Amino acid sequence: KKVVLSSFSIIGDITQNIAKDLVTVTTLVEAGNDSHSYQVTSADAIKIQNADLILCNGLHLEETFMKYFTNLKKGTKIITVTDGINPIGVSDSEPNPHAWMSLTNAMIYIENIRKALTALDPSNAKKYELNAREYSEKIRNSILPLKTRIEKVDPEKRWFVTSEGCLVYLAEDFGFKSLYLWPINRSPSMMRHAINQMRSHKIKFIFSESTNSDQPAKQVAYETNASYGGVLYVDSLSKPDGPAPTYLDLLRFSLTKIVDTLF
Ligand SMILES: [Mn+2]
């Protein structure tokens, strides 16, 4: 039985829905850790040796631990599952890694993982084909109604404001503008800028996220006369009893919370 190692929980969950136990799906940065601050362990090196295929986000998400993907099993490839996604920069600059926060991009992650699994395990092509389409429609069925309601927002309430720049791909996909305090899980000028921008556009809400502090968002809410919108799930699946234990649940939770704020 082949073993497919995903770099973090969001990719591991997508892969599990495409492979459904045809392969063993493992995860390096488990739910609760972010990629942004992950220490590769000895036991992790075992997961890395056992991998027949390694699925990374790319867009520099794994930059600090790419050096551990070395001395690999012969024949083991590293596949970047964001292939085909036009990068959004962090400033000409380093890419923003959060491409999975997008309904369009969900379909591209699924397609790239379907393609990689099928090249790895061609005798199950028909099953990965079927599973990928079923899962793409599951995502569409849950998420498209959220998109539909949020597209009703008045064109000057079209702002997603967060702490980390975790929604830039969502903004691009749905036609909104972004504002945030720092691109990747911090600087005084970016905070000053967000405060100014919120005041000039009369922005009503700012969120924080499940792996970072709520204090800068609450502070900005105060200074701008906006409201703190609460916590979004964007960088990691929640624990099993939390609200975002799967990638579908994560998109559904965070987009629900955004749309519920904008109306
Ligand atoms: Mn992040």
Automatic annotation (TrEMBL):
The keyword Metal-binding applies. One of its GO terms (cellular component) is cell envelope. Keywords: Metal-binding, Signal, Transport, Zinc. Transmembrane segments: none annotated. Belongs to the bacterial solute-binding protein 9 family. Pfam families: ZnuA (PF01297). Zn(2+) binds at residues 36, 98, 164, 235. It is found in: Cell envelope. GO terms for molecular function: metal ion binding. This is Periplasmic solute binding protein. Mn(2+) binds at residues 36, 98, 164, 235. PANTHER family: HIGH-AFFINITY ZINC UPTAKE SYSTEM PROTEIN ZNUA-RELATED, METAL-BINDING PROTEIN HI_0362-RELATED. The keyword Endoplasmic reticulum does not apply. It comes from the Bacteria. One of its GO terms (biological process) is metal ion transport.
